[PDB]
Amino acid sequence: TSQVRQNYHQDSEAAINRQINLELYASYVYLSMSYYFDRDDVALKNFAKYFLHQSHEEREHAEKLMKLQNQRGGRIFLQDIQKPDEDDWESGLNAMEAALHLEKNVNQSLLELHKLAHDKNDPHLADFIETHYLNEQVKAIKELGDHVTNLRKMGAPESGLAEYLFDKHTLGD
Amino acid sequence: TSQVRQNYHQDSEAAINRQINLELYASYVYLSMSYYFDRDDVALKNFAKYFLHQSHEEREHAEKLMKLQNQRGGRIFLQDIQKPDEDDWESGLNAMEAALHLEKNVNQSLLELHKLAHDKNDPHLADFIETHYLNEQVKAIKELGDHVTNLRKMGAPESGLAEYLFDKHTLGD
Amino acid sequence: TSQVRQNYHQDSEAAINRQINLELYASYVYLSMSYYFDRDDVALKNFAKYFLHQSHEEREHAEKLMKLQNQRGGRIFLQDIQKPDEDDWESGLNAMEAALHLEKNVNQSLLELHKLAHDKNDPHLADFIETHYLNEQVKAIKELGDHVTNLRKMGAPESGLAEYLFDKHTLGD
Amino acid sequence: TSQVRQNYHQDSEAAINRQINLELYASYVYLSMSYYFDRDDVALKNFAKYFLHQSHEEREHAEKLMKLQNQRGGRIFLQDIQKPDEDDWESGLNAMEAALHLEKNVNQSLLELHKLAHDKNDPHLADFIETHYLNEQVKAIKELGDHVTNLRKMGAPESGLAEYLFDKHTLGD
Amino acid sequence: TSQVRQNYHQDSEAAINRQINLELYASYVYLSMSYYFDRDDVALKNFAKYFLHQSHEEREHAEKLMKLQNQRGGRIFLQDIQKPDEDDWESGLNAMEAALHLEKNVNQSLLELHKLAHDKNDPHLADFIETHYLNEQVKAIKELGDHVTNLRKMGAPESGLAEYLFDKHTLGD
Amino acid sequence: TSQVRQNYHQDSEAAINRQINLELYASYVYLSMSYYFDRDDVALKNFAKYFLHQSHEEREHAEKLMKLQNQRGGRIFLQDIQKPDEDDWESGLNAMEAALHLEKNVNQSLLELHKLAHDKNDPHLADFIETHYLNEQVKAIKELGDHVTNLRKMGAPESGLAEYLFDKHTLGD
Ligand SMILES: O=C(NO)c1ccc(C(=O)NO)o1
Ligand SMILES: O=C(NO)c1ccc(C(=O)NO)o1
Ligand code: NA
Ligand code: NA
Ligand code: NI
Ligand code: NI
Ligand code: NI
Ligand code: NI
Ligand code: NI
Ligand code: NI
Numbered sequence A, B, C, D, E, F: 001t002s003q004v005r006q007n008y009h010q011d012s013e014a015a016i017n018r019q020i021n022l023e024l025y026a027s028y029v030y031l032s033m034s035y036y037f038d039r040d041d042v043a044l045k046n047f048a049k050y051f052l053h054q055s056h057e058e059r060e061h062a063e064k065l066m067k068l069q070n071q072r073g074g075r076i077f078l079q080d081i082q083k084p085d086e087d088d089w090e091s092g093l094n095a096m097e098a099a100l101h102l103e104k105n106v107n108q109s110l111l112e113l114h115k116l117a118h119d120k121n122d123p124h125l126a127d128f129i130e131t132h133y134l135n136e137q138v139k140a141i142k143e144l145g146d147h148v149t150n151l152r153k154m155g156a157p158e159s160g161l162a163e164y165l166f167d168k169h170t171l172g173d
């Protein structure tokens, strides 16, 4: 067993490995959505930028977790990364709703991880989640919610005008 | 015969002269479209800027080819430049669709030129096309396609609002 | 009829369209001459620069006229652009003499246009010609005349030395 | 079918989708190796930096291909990303040899893709591979080969001294 | 066999070694011509500069090829470098004509190398030639052709005045 | 006979031509060694840099001599440049020992040239050797000797560790 390990339960170690896989999956989902808005029959440059940025942020989530794992003494075990549910996201509104759903999923997974960490009385891991992950998910969900509300009040996804204007006036700057 | 000529088939020379004429024709077409959007009963300043820029780019395409011709030892033979098909382009959407069609035309002509160059085992001419022309046409077509898709999703050419907003939010910056 | 049109006779409109075509033709002629001096069996870099610059200046002449047309309420009607008289200009001296002739041609066409403008009592169009075109042609003709005189006093086109030195000492800087 | 598609064979489209998946797989492999050198019982910071950089470069390979796909008119179809062959890479030397093998694999896949592109007479796609991928793989293989040779001449993986010094004197700067 | 070798035919390897030798030979020829214009009974400083620069450029051609060879897995085999055909180049015009001939020779050798590379379906080597060698030879030949034409139209090599003026007005700046 | 010649014995002229050939040969030898350390199965970047620099320095030795020759009134006569003795230099230590031997050879040739120059009472040529060549060879030999001693005291060429560390700690900076 690793010389640095201390107060690191194997249940925690397994949760960390699962969370790593999930963050990588989310990165894959966001990559999918981004290049779906790059298509010549969708053509929403700023939606594409937005989801590409979110993809890279989830990738950094994963890497932060892997470094945490090696720091505590656990061992990283990588699994396959599943293909996203869809290859075609229909609209900007629907991609936003999907992203909101995905982030609520990852949030619940993190909440159960923090619960397991408090239960195995691992306060350092509990605070690592408290600091680097919980509030980022709260912000991400509130932001996606704002986006969904605005796109809806504009008549998306019926009005193609709505998505075109949103792309310019919100996801530009 | 010119002292510099080497491995330059006369079939290639004829193709180059034809491509020169075609690039000049395209420049004329884009000039037409540009000043059609300058009209007081159309009045789309940014459409006008866009097609004027594209006109000058095609002019430089032609000049690059003429310099290539003199470099290989061929001789430039200029022909008349035909008037564009139309004097009135109806709308911004229709001008975009016409431009997309014209660029697919010039692309197919360039592809047949590259084929002829590979067949007469003229690798320098093949790579000149590979480098300075093929990818520029791929980019131009994808861009015009984006423009057509967006203008359509906004309700062009019915909605005059759509073309007015596109002119400002996409062809401005 | 266009909402901006005022005091713009249709005879003037036709003259403007013809002058546009002629300026474009001249641009084509200068393009021809330029790349004739780019040939490996002529090889006069500064002659080439000179006629390329003159080509682009005539192109701007045309565009200025097209904008004038749309400003007055007329409608631009583009015609074919004829191939230059020659594909081979023999020498620097002969190209200069041809250019002088072409500019005297375009000058006479502009003078008849100004006459028509004064006759249809269109003072704005008369002054547009007075300002942006007449004096430029006077300068261009005097300059080409200087060039022809110098090239002749040097023994062009017999002396190839003469054209080589002129290219360096006059068309360089 | 997409409005921009021209001369893009569906066999090419399938090859592109497969190459995208493979570049993503390679990125996953390099991520694995990197965080294997982050372990407290391996502890080779510069090996870790090296393979993390290579991971991000392969990720950009994938994204470049996805943008190419949307540009030509094809449609991106994402598949699962397989877990790397190993979870434990034994040594710096063995990780280098594995990386060399993986890059020879991806190189052969790209070579067969270029062959298919030349056969379906798709010169733009052939040159896209020629430019953005072939030489990068030649460089990567020669570099990994240098690394393997040096690590071997130093007595890796027996001598832990060898890997420690290589980490500092080659992968530092 | 070298660990990096992949898709590198031994016929290609032999062609590369021969091309290395030929580029070195050309460098030797240009060195010869340069210091022939340094002689007190020729005394053409700018001709000398010109051919010395061209000598060093051919030397870099050779070195680029040697690095390519080691990159693909081949092995560099150096041969003797033959003395130039002449020790006395008669005139500036004759040196230029000789240089034009030599560059057409090396161009044909490179063209046959590119043919062999396309035939052994080595696209990376084909593109290495396409990029770093073919167009440089096209430019070099067109430039030498310009020089020969100008020197001839000035009455070289009879007129010593012609070569003296060319040295100053073309090979200076 | 050349108008500038004064006190320049033909025996000296022949010695100069031979020394030119020898400096060029040495440049070829150093080029060989350099790209031998570029091989993926040798891979000593700094050895490669070192011998490439030495190659270019010998090339400048040759050119300095050729300019000296034209200055005194002699005539440069170029001969073939022989291939180096070896195509494979075994190790860094052995390349260093070979280079030391080659520089002692060229030094003895220069010493006999200075002797011939003092004997034909050519003090300018004697001092040209004294200044631009003798001390450079003394420095080069002492430096190569230092290198050989250090590589030996480190256990080269047995210890591959020794050559790897020398490459970094001495030939880097
Ligand atoms: O917050 C707690 N530990 O940190 C906790 C959870 C349940 C209990 C308990 O058993 N109360 O009776 O305590
Ligand atoms: O056999 C052939 N046609 O029937 C053939 C000759 C050369 C090529 C070719 O261009 N390969 O890349 O193909
Ligand atoms: Na290419
Ligand atoms: Na006035
Ligand atoms: Ni996340
Ligand atoms: Ni509690
Ligand atoms: Ni074009
Ligand atoms: Ni004009
Ligand atoms: Ni890759
Ligand atoms: Ni060369």
Ligand code: NI
Pocket (backbone or CB within 6 Å): B118, D118, E118
């Ligand atoms: Ni082929």
Ligand code: NI
Pocket (backbone or CB within 6 Å): F023, F026, F057, F058, F061, F106
């Ligand atoms: Ni020397």
